[PDB]
Scaffold this active site. Structure first.
Site, mmCIF file in Angstrom:
data_model
loop_
_atom_site.group_PDB
_atom_site.id
_atom_site.type_symbol
_atom_site.label_atom_id
_atom_site.label_comp_id
_atom_site.label_asym_id
_atom_site.label_seq_id
_atom_site.Cartn_x
_atom_site.Cartn_y
_atom_site.Cartn_z
ATOM 1 N N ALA A 101 0.823 -1.205 0.000
ATOM 2 C CA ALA A 101 0.000 0.000 0.000
ATOM 3 C C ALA A 101 0.859 1.259 0.000
ATOM 4 O O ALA A 101 0.766 2.089 -0.911
ATOM 5 C CB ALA A 101 -0.942 -0.010 1.206
ATOM 6 N N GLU A 102 1.705 1.417 1.021
ATOM 7 C CA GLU A 102 2.532 2.616 1.116
ATOM 8 C C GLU A 102 3.566 2.680 0.000
ATOM 9 O O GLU A 102 3.992 3.775 -0.386
ATOM 10 C CB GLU A 102 3.215 2.677 2.482
ATOM 11 C CG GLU A 102 2.262 2.638 3.671
ATOM 12 C CD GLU A 102 1.498 3.938 3.874
ATOM 13 O OE1 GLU A 102 1.704 4.890 3.091
ATOM 14 O OE2 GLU A 102 0.689 4.008 4.824
#
Length: 242
Positions: free
Chosen positions: A166-167
């Site tokens: 995600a990040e």
């Protein structure tokens, strides 16, 4: 909508992330130099989601290829992780608005915030070590997980995968530093405090870049940008601030 993030080699991992980015976002006309650009998440109806299939963790130890993540498109927030071997969707608390058909949704007691996940895992993101070996271990913790309360090993596994899936999509700097671990001479990516600062200030970051008309630099919070070559090398996808 489904996507595959292939951790086989660095090329397959980067191409997987950039495949997701172009489908769910669109670059800015102000910050874009070649293929490397800073994109804005495409507007989608609230509650929309896309899937993420975790492939390529290791070829020689027989194909750990049955872990899936559910990500909310509007904010790239990992709503939960799916055990495709058991057809079970372990979903966080604050994502009740995310319903996945054709699966079984186990609603848990733990939310998705880093405040809760760090505590239960007893592991600080600042200094967290992610390697191909530890990514395989993170897979095993999530596959062997059963229940509706996040355990220490699962949170030590969710924290690692969310950072590299995600990040990593949001921040190109996180992707660049970690993808080294997928090489033949596999190193250990160590999440610096600067990387943690990026993720904690994503909301503040996404609010600034649309203003950028090619000025000298940008300083939001502690994040000092000297030029545009820092923006393109640090941030990849930002929120759609309407």
């Amino acid at each position: 909508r489904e996507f595959t993030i292939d951790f086989s080699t660095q090329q397959s991992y980067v191409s997987s992330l950039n495949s997701i980015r172009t489908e769910i976002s669109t670059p800015l006309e102000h910050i874009s130099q070649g293929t490397t650009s800073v994109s804005v998440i495409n507007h989608t109806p609230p509650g929309s989601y896309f899937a993420v299939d975790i492939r390529g963790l290791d070829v020689y130890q027989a194909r750990f290829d049955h872990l899936r993540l559910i990500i909310e498109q509007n904010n790239l927030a990992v709503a939960g992780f799916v055990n495709t071997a058991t057809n079970t969707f372990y979903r966080f608390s604050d994502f009740t608005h995310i319903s996945v058909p054709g699966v079984t949704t186990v609603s848990m007691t733990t939310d998705s915030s880093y405040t809760t996940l760090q505590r239960v895992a007893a592991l600080e993101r600042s200094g967290m070590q992610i390697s191909r070996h530890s990514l395989v271990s993170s897979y095993l913790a999530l596959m062997e997980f059963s229940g509706n309360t996040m355990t220490r090993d699962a949170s030590r596994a969710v924290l690692r995968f969310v950072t590299v899936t995600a990040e990593a999509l949001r921040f190109r700097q996180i992707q660049r530093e970690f993808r080294q671990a997928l090489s033949e001479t596999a190193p250990v990516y160590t999440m610096t405090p600067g990387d943690v600062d990026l993720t904690l200030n994503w909301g503040r970051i996404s609010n600034v870049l649309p203003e950028y008309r090619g000025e000298d630099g940008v300083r939001v919070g502690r994040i000092s940008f000297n030029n545009i070559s820092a923006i393109l090398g640090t941030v990849a996808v930002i929120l759609n601030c309407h």
